[PDB]
Each structure stands twice: as structure tokens, then as C-alpha cells.
Amino acid sequence: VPISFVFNRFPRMVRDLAKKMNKEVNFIMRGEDTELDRTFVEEIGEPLLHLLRNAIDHGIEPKEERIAKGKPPIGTLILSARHEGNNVVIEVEDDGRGIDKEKIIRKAIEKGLIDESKAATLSDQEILNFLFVPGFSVGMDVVKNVVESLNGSISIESEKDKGTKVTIRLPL
Ligand SMILES: Oc1cccc(O)c1
């Protein structure tokens, strides 16, 4: 199928979520032509919807907050697909507040998963990996479990005030 069978439902959903959350969102879709196995298109919808929800809820800041921090007033959400080899790569990127890595660390210490000394030398990717720990947080463990049932991989990149990029790699 073209991935557009999934991507064509997101403009309405993002718009309804942005309206519910009183948030101004510039939503852009690219690579909707990208074709992949029907089993993927039937299952990739729900995980991508979760990621779009997360970006709009926890990521994108309200216009007035963006203006106070000197950002472009309306936040941007980009959903993309492309071919890489015999994989498909799907990206959800926002220019919102990003993931607070210091908050992750604090929570991880509170949950007994690491001590303060070990937290000081963690890389950014080991920190962000805490989000995939079942109910660490949102929902990144359940997104992971679906991608994994499709034999895909997922990664997250994030920087404070810069934004967040989640990338899903799928086989075929
Ligand atoms: O902007 C964000 C923040 C948190 C999780 C997410 O998938 C996106």
C-alpha cells in the first residue's frame, strides 16, 4: 500500500487534538507516496498516532510561550516517510520544548534504576533509552512494543528547547 492510506487520516486527528489542547500547530506531511507491505500499514497507524499526540501535548508549546522564548510563534510537526535500502524510515519531528534529560535522570534515580554516580557519565542516548522502560513515563514502551512486533526499530533524539525526533525503521 502507499503509506498515505495511514497518513491521510492524520490531518484531521492532529487538527482535532490541537483544537482540544488549545494549541497552534503547523502540520506537514512528506513522502506519503512511500509504499510498503499491507501488514505494516494496518499496524503502523496507532503507534504513529501516539507519537503525534505526544508531540502536540508534551512537545509543542503554546504560541505565547514560543513568542516569549523567541521561537517562530506557531510550532511545526513534520511526519515523513522515505525508502532507505529495503527499509522504510518514518520520522515524527517537532520543534517544541524537547525532552528534559535532567528530569529523566531524577525519575530514574527515584525509581531505583541507577545511582547518582552512574548517572553523571550516561550518554544522551542512554538517558533517552529510559523512556522505553515499561511505564517509565508518554507511552514510549507501548510504541516500542508495536514497532518490535513489526520487526522494526525505534530511536529518539531530543534537545531541550530544540525539539524531538522519533524515527521508526521498518523492514521490507
Ligand atoms: O515532543 C515530544 C515530547 C515527548 C515525546 C514525544 O514523542 C515528542
Numbering used by the authors: 5 to 141, 154 to 188
How do the authors describe this structure?
Our attempts to co-crystallize the DPP derivative with the CA domain of CheA from T. maritima, a class II HK for which robust crystallization protocols have been established, failed. However, we successfully obtained the X-ray crystal structure of the resorcinol fragment bound to CheA-CA with a resolution of 2.1 Å. The overall structure showed a solvent-accessible binding pocket where the resorcinol was observed making contact with the conserved aspartate (Asp449): the one hydroxyl from the resorcinol is in the proximity of the conserved aspartate (Asp449) and the ordered water molecule W1, while the other hydroxyl of the resorcinol forms water-bridged contacts with the backbone carbonyl a leucine residue (Leu406; Val386 in PhoQ E. coli). The binding mode of the resorcinol resembles the predicted binding mode of DPP-5 and is nearly identical to the interaction formed by the DPP CCT018159 with Hsp90α. The crystal binding mode of the resorcinol fragment supports the hypothesis that resorcinol-containing DPP compounds are likely to retain the binding mode observed in Hsp90. Docking studies indicate that the substitution pattern on ring A influences the binding mode, with the resorcinol-based derivatives likely to adopt a binding mode analogous to the crystal-bound complex of CCT018159-Hsp90α, an observation also supported by the X-ray crystal structure of resorcinol in complex with the HK CheA. The CheA-CA domain was crystallized by the sitting-drop vapor-diffusion method at 21°C using 0.4 µL of 25 mg/mL CheA-CA protein mixed with 0.4 µL of reservoir solution containing 30% (wt/vol) PEG 8000, 0.6 M ammonium acetate, 0.065 M sodium acetate pH 4.5. Monoclinic crystals appeared within 24 hours, and 0.2 µL of 20 mM resorcinol solution (Enamine, Frankfurt, Germany) was added to the crystallization drops. The part of the lid loop corresponding to residues 492–505 could not be built owing to the absence of the corresponding electron density in the area.
Typically, TCSs consist of a sensor histidine kinase (HK) and a response regulator (RR). Prototypical HKs are membrane-bound dimers comprising a sensor domain that detects their cognate stimuli, a catalytic ATP binding domain (CA) that binds ATP and, upon signal detection, autophosphorylates a conserved histidine in the dimerization, and a histidine phosphotransfer domain (DHp). The ATP-binding pocket of HKs adopts the Bergerat fold, an α/β sandwich characterized by four conserved regions (the N-box, the G1-box, the G2-box, and the G3-box) and the highly variable ATP-lid. The Bergerat fold has been observed in the ATP-binding domain of the GHKL protein superfamily, which includes DNA gyrases, the molecular chaperone Hsp90, bacterial HKs, and the MutL mismatch repair enzyme.
